[PDB]
Amino acid sequence: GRMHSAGKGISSSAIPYSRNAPAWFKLSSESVIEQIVKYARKGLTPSQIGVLLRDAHGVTQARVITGNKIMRILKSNGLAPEIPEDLYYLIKKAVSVRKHLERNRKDKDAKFRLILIESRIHRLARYYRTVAVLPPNWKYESATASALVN
Amino acid sequence: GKGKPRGLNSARKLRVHRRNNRWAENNYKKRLLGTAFKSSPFGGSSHAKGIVLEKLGIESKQPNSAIRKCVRVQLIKNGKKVTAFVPNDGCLNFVDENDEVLLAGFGRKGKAKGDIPGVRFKVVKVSGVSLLALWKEKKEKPRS
Amino acid sequence: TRSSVLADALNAINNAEKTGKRQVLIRPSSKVIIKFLQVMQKHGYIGEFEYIDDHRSGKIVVQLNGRLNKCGVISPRFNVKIGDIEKWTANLLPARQFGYVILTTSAGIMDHEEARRKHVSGKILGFVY
RNA sequence: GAAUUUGGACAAACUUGGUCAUUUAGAGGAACUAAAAGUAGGUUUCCGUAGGUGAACCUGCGGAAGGAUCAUUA
RNA sequence: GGAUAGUGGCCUACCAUGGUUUCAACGGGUAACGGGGAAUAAGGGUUCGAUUCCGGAGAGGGAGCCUGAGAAACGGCUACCACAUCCAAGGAAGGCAGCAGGCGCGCAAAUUACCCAAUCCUAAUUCAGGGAGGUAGUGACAAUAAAUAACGAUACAGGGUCUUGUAAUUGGAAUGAGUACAAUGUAAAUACCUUAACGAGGAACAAUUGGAGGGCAAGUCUGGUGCCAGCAGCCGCGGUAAUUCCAGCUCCAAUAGCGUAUAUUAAAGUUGUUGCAGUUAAAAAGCUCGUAGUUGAACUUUGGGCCCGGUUAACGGGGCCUUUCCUUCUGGCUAAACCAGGACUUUUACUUUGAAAAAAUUAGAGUGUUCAAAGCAGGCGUAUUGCUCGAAUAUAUUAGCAUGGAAUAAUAGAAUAGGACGUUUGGUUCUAUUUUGUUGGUUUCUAGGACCAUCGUAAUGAUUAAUAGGGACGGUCGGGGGCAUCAGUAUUCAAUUGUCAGAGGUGAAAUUCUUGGAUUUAUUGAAGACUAACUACUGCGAAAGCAUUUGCCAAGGACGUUUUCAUUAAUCAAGAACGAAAGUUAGGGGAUCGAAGAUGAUCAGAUACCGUCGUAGUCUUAACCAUAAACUAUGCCGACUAGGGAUCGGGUGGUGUUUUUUUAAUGACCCACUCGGCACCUUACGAGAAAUCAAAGUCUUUGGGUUCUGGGGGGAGUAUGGUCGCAAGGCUGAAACUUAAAGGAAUUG
């Protein structure tokens, strides 16, 4: 089920049984690539690029049209951020809930949720520095993480 | 499932769990604490020898009784005083005070066989000769 | 989480036979599951199975024909030295004339009589009778 | 070339100080025993905790049933 | 460097600051010499191994040392310690855990015997010596074989003319327990095997040990003994917590053996890997996070054809082709490509085979020790100079070595190309087995490497996106949390007012307030707490818990998604967050209720043990404590198995309903479907001791992953130790002893 909850939901997306280039698309293969790098240069994460492409321009998913995934496209042209997207968002959430916990001391529910979020951050950071994406230590700390997010 | 580890490399947890569980027994706990040597009435032995301190008259009931009473005996090696069970009537007059009786167990691993509470030993020899044969007028007691 | 897919397949087949169904669907699929089903199919314990292929892992539809008493998996997969093989049979088969235990040897996945005939052995995998 | 002698390493052992541990004397007390034989009433059952009482026991706060659901309509 | 026979922190001088450990280091115990092995036999295990073989260590405790190849030797020496011997009192000598033997200790263990004859050892060595060893004595440790009787005749009972048993009936045969000429045996004897002579008629030459309610086999026996306010009266009957009180007859089991005591093993699945249990019988941490540990989705050469060839058409073997034998090099066919040949795991785990593995022991083949336990003997002949078989085989489950396999489970490779391949060209860096007579140095060529750059050669290099997971977004949803704010009656108190004699309290009184007006009524004000009815077999939260309005702050599940990354996960000692009520230290405020306390009346009955006042507390802030029947008495993750009706959240569809004021969005409702919840009813495909359970199912046909806890009842959550807490106390947590039951679930008197 979940990782830090009692839920057991299964809501997700379902990739179709067709790896071949839907016929009503028939537009291009590279034009979406410089459009993707334009969207990234505008300042979006790969997930936001994907949702805008499937909401506006009929790209079912960028993996089937181009042959490469979105993050590899951004990494190929030197648009990759120094830390990955999901770890960045987890650190941002931890910073916000830590500010809230600082202003309201007696919120013990926020204390428990912060402990859960930080344990999730530690697991993800251990995976990233194991697969050699992050620097070999990267030393997640309470203070400098704020200076890490902005 | 079953509540225990089952991995192929999970033998150390099984071993230490079995060690602790075996410590929660009674035979193993007394065997590997050496209880039969420090606190046992014997020295972890089968028979023993001791002088008869006194003879105590615990009868069955009020005067219409069956005479089943025996003696209080102090040991030779431990110096500990226990109570015995002399066999049937006619054997009671043989065992006097300070009579160097040889004793055995009674047959329930340290528990009282029979309906006499508080006896775990029985006299096997009196004055270092016999008790069964001396009762059956087959031999005679040597003097001192 | 899914520790063993072979356990799921064998438990599904046992439950389907004990309920009294005709065909059963198994997900996921594996080379080990396929080879186990091929041995069970060769010895007549199951009927005919098909490999439905989506892109992810596959599914298997097995059509049973009865004559299946019990199939089961042995987790963990112990190393079975050859002189020990009949010992395993003597633990978990009802008799000596029928009943099979399945060994994953370096010559493939095979029943124990073929393992004794080929003078080869390996890890244990499961049993069927 | 003996008795004898200087220094050193190897060191048994004796005197003191501390420490570890076993056994035995010692007021006091509390427990248990067979002690054949001493001085009518309340009845929900508990749990945690606080206070009080020769004596179980009582009271305050929170919790459990290991406590016996009838009539009606929908 | 010293020292040693030699390496070495083995020691010394100098310099570094290292080494081991939750995969349990270091410390403590051992009624611990280690092993070959022993008992137990369905398997796996459990228990013992002082002891006949191998290795270690010691000779009362330590230390030191000469001789010698070898000793830190003690049937050698020296000193100290503890014992202790001798005497002329000056001095001298000591070491049985060698063989006998003595004392002591104990439940527990033999002759101060004979001999080198065997086996081997020592010496100058065939010859001497050997308490090593062998022989005999004691010996019911254990083990082997089997004496205490067999056959008739007569009379009866039979089945019934051939077969059994009975008998104070009867006949003779056979033989060794012993005694013993002899011979053998033996170093000399004893004993065994052989044997002249003697040796059997029952109190002979005599078999015992336990038992007879059940377990567990065999008494619907006999007599006597001790008790009676039971009947009779001196004969007795019957009863006797006489737990039989004792003898005799008869019977059962084993037998030259049988019983008892302690320990251990099997039956025991009361240790449970195989193979236990945890709703209620012992036992699921109050809940969650989380390190070590254990465990972890699928995927990459499959298939086909060809032959040859092993066993009685089936099983199993290897080479060729199918894009398919890749790799480290010499000698030849040749014009980088073949043959004859030396071999190779990126790293493992696993598995087959093999070597090297003391004997004895175990399993086992042969052989009539007269049989057998044993032993490795033996067998056959013209038994006159002889012949010949054998002393096998197996097991050894870890580690190390060699080897065939490549399923299963792991590890790595090209993502900033810094990747591979070459008769692609340039430069640098080094080396020479050589030839110029051998050598040292100098140079070129040649050949071999390594490095830095440019041409190409190529299908140039990135597995799915798990009805695993985390992330993003969209619309929601909730009595989820914090802060601030708003409201509702109610309770208590106060002010003003109306009217009069009681108001409270109890089963009955009394204390209490009251003609300065009690209780009651009306208007108003203040304080603190709490949020009824709505409120449900509804919701939210990890649990504890959460119920007036509004706003802010951050969070959360479920649904939807042709979004994102590609294993990031499950469980979890160490460690940590929260944790009802009660309780502790200070501040606040104190309306109700209220431990403690104070008073009233205590009336057989309180069945109806009370009343009033009231401290701490109840509320809050900052610190503490960490326990509850913290309960669903049911750990967490995953898979599958059965029908039905409600209900909450999200989504999909309806030429469906309703309100629009025109039937457009949207809301409420109905029908169908789906996902995720809280629950409910019936049933057993199943389970269970039952109550009952869709999980407590998928289990004698026993294995998806993982953590914690239990081992008959008391003593006892007690004692002691540690640790946390100001304290209360919490966490961990025994033993001696005592007992044959304690207990769970239903039906019935």
Author numbering:
A (entry chain SN): 2 to 151
B (entry chain SX): 2 to 145
C (entry chain SW): 2 to 130
Article excerpt on this structure:
After dissociation of all 90S factors, the 40S body adopts a close-to-mature conformation, whereas the 3' major domain, later forming the 40S head, remains entirely immature. By combining yeast and human structures, we uncovered 16 different pre-40S assembly intermediates, most of which represent the long-sought nucleoplasmic pre-40S ribosome.
The most notable feature of Tsr1-1, the earliest state, is the highly flexible 40S head. This observation was not too surprising since the head of the primordial pre-40S (state Dis-C) is highly stretched and mostly dynamic and invisible. Unlike the highly dynamic 40S head, the 5' and central domains of the 18S rRNA are almost mature, as in the primordial pre-40S. However, state Tsr1-1 has already lost all its remaining 90S AFs, including the U3 snoRNA. However, the time point at which this occurs is not clearly defined; indeed, states Tsr1-1 and Tsr1-2 were both observed with and without uS5 incorporated. Although, we were missing the states that could show the remodeling of the primordial pre-40S (now described by Cheng et al.NAR), the Tsr1 states are likely to represent the earliest nucleoplasmic intermediates, in which the 40S head is prepared for further remodeling.
